[PDB]
Amino acid sequence: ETVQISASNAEAKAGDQFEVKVSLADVPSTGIQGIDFAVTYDNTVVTIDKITVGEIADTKAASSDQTASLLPTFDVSIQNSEGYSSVIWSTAVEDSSYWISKDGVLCTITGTVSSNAKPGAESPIKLEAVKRETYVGSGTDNSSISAGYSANDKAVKYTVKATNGKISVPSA
């Protein structure tokens, strides 16, 4: 099975804030217990201020999973100086009704266009795998976005199709 993930486009002046919606489509009926992806960008043009949980990930898992208070279900790490932000959603709850199960907004990105950004300038907002090794000392990077679930402690991993977004600055 397979699932689509995509980032919307935005327009904003230099120094202004913008929003980008990250959406899932064709979420399998079996659901998503864990999902992991990176948002990559050019930090001379944009920086991310926050990333907020979306409607489809706003389930009972966040408040009922025992380990949620030790590590939040919707877990974000913004790395502007490294030119990326990493988004992980996961849960140990077995009840599939508490997993991500519908198409819609996964999360909302809020960022700021550089004060220096000249008119017409652009920057892609790409959705891709976090730059890390497959395992420690492997010497090979993680190459795909992760999305799926576990049954009998065995991973069922969906294929992920990514559509990137864009931020552009108008003229005056």
Binding site: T67, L70, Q79, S86, I88, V130, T134, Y135, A155
Partner: protein, 65 residues
């Protein structure tokens, strides 16, 4: 290998799900892979360190100090 709780040769979000369950019980099948700071327990430190590796901010496992 450290961080690989299902033992499939990858370290990913599906191991983190197993790490969460391992913390609830304080135990898992591949205990040595889960005990990332090597202090004899699986708890919130290990869960955090695993999450940090997946985020790409922690470069190495196991953890020192």
């Amino acid at each position: 290998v450290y961080g690989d709780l299902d033992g499939d040769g990858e370290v990913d979000v599906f191991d983190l799900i197993l790490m969460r369950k391992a913390v609830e019980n304080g135990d898992t099948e591949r205990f040595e892979a889960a005990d990332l700071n090597c202090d004899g327990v699986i708890d919130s430190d290990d869960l955090t360190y695993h999450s940090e590796y997946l985020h790409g901010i922690r470069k190495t496992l196991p953890v020192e100090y």
